[PDB]
């Protein structure tokens, strides 16, 4: 039985998101990529240099926004500037959200020597796709 | 059946004979109860599982404007109606049996579901049927084409006259004031 990126079936009460509700064989069929760049092309290079920075940011944002991050990040890479789209719950005050976004846009940009954009979308709760 | 000794007249060389006097009395009572329900705008369902006159019963129900059921009787039809038929349905106010025993020679399911849901039943019971649960039973024969035609026509005219008299009474009520 395949277990990679596959959440098993419970008694029928667990809420699952649109991403976890799809097996790994649905990538580019029904669900899209969480990261977009040029390193994964045919005649292009720098596949690992972007992958390590992707994983580092996956961990950094998870540690920066604990408990309030709903789903995974959307990491776009477009013309020397990288965009980070996040779906955050509205648990923290707006002042604490702005403090953290201003800290991130100034820390990650200087840490990776490239401009970073951080876009936040506040959801009231985790959007449930399948049974809940 | 043991509950047919008071409803039998005798036995002519093995074949039993039904007493037509009590047959006609019970038939009078059954037809009166059937006509009153049709006059009071009551849903009448002819439930009869018999693969010989399924077409005749459905045609009689079509000509009467009442409903019929001669196919495989589903389990939770009258009990689990809010799940089989729809969200909230209106159960038949009267159930009429033209064949009490189904193809397995066992009592039908509707004859018990009517008593379980408090629904009156008027049924033709043969010498092998159980009239213990039917409200207005009539000891007769449900295997003869002429018998089933006679019963179908009797219920046909009993529904037609009841509906026509209801319409006449409503017409008179419209002129009452």
């Amino acid at each position: 039985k395949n277990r990679a990126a596959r959440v098993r079936v419970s008694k029928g009460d667990k809420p699952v998101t649109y991403e976890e509700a799809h097996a790994p064989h649905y990538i580019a069929h029904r669900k899209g990529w969480l990261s977009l760049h040029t390193g994964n092309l045919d005649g292009e290079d720098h596949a690992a240099e972007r992958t390590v920075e992707d994983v580092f940011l996956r961990k950094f944002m998870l540690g920066t926004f604990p408990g309030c991050l709903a789903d995974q990040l959307v990491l776009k890479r477009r013309a020397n500037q990288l965009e980070i789209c996040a779906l955050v719950l509205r648990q923290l005050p707006p002042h604490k959200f702005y403090f953290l976004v201003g800290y991130s846009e100034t820390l990650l940009s200087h840490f990776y020597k490239c401009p970073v954009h951080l876009h936040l979308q506040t959801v009231p709760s985790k959007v449930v796709y399948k049974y809940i | 059946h043991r509950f047919m000794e008071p409803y039998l007249f005798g036995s002519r060389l093995g074949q039993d004979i039904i007493d037509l006097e009590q047959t006609a009395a019970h038939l009078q009572l059954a037809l009166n109860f059937t006509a009153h329900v049709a006059y009071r705008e009551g849903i009448i369902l002819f439930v009869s599982r018999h693969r010989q006159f399924a077409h005749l019963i459905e045609t009689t129900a079509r000509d009467c404007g009442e409903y019929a059921h001669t196919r495989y009787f589903k389990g939770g039809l009258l009990t689990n109606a809010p799940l089989l038929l729809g969200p909230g349905v209106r159960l038949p106010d009267l159930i009429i049996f033209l064949h009490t025993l189904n193809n397995v020679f066992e009592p039908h399911v509707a004859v018990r579901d009517a008593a379980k849901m408090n629904i009156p039943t008027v049924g033709i019971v043969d010498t092998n049927c159980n009239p213990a649960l039917i409200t207005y039973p009539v000891p007769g024969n449900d295997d003869s084409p002429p018998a089933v035609r006679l019963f179908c026509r009797l219920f046909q005219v009993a529904i037609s006259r009841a509906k026509e008299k209801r319409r006449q009474v409503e017409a008179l009520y419209r002129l009452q004031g």
Binding site: H29, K31 | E41, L45, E58, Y67, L77, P92
Partner: protein
Amino acid sequence: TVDFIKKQIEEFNIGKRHLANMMGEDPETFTQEDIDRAIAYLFPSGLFEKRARPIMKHPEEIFPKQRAIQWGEDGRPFHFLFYTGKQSYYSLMHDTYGKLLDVEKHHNQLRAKDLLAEKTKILKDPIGSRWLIKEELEEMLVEKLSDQDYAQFIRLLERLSALPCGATEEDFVNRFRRSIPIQSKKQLIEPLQYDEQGMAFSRGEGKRKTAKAEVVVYGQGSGRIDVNGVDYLLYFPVTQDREQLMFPLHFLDRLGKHDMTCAVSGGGRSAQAGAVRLAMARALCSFVTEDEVEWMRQAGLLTADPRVRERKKPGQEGARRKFTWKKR
């Protein structure tokens, strides 16, 4: 959820208005033909499933529908078989049995009066009409249908068909018939063109096992083939490859009546021969009549060869050959 449906209708209307505004087309002439393309352009979601792509249609199409009202305000069901579970399927069965009894009595009266003016309309071989399938019946009758009930309905239909049908009975039986999806598998013939004072000009294309061949044939010259500038005898030394070229010509008796020039790319010694054969067969249709084209497509000259090499599988040798499976 009627309020929700109305709110979604209003939202779709205002969103369509704003989409027409932001696209720059006239909102009155703005319809779904433009909606689909505008959405596909503004949200370039490249997926292998079209249903997963963003789509904005009418709410009556987005949200599914269900069964209509069965009983009025008084509660009395409309149909006379509502207490049967399938007020549509059992009504159809009852009407079919009634028409069957009517046809039976009509035929009995005709036999008693010694009149046989009907025929047997059951042999549907040249028409190719097949009966309905479970899906074709469940798309007509909104409610579900069981397999045994479907088989019973089909057998009752064939019973009714096995008897002399009437005037409207023929239409009643045929309204539950589905013929070939197009019923016209006959191919189209390319018109005879004339390029630079060259009459009896035709062109054809063929392919078999990754070998694409184009043939240009002239029906006015002698019988010979020009394969990539060199002779066919020198291009195909094996007898089989030359028989592959002679096969489409021998069936039409056009051995010394057509001069052809073929160009093939890909394949080996037999794939090229098969591709040239297919191209020649598809090109020679412009010189023969319809019956010979039918004979060729029945002989397999106008049909491709889908037998290609299967991809190799992990843990195997030739997509079928498995390793030595030791029992112990």
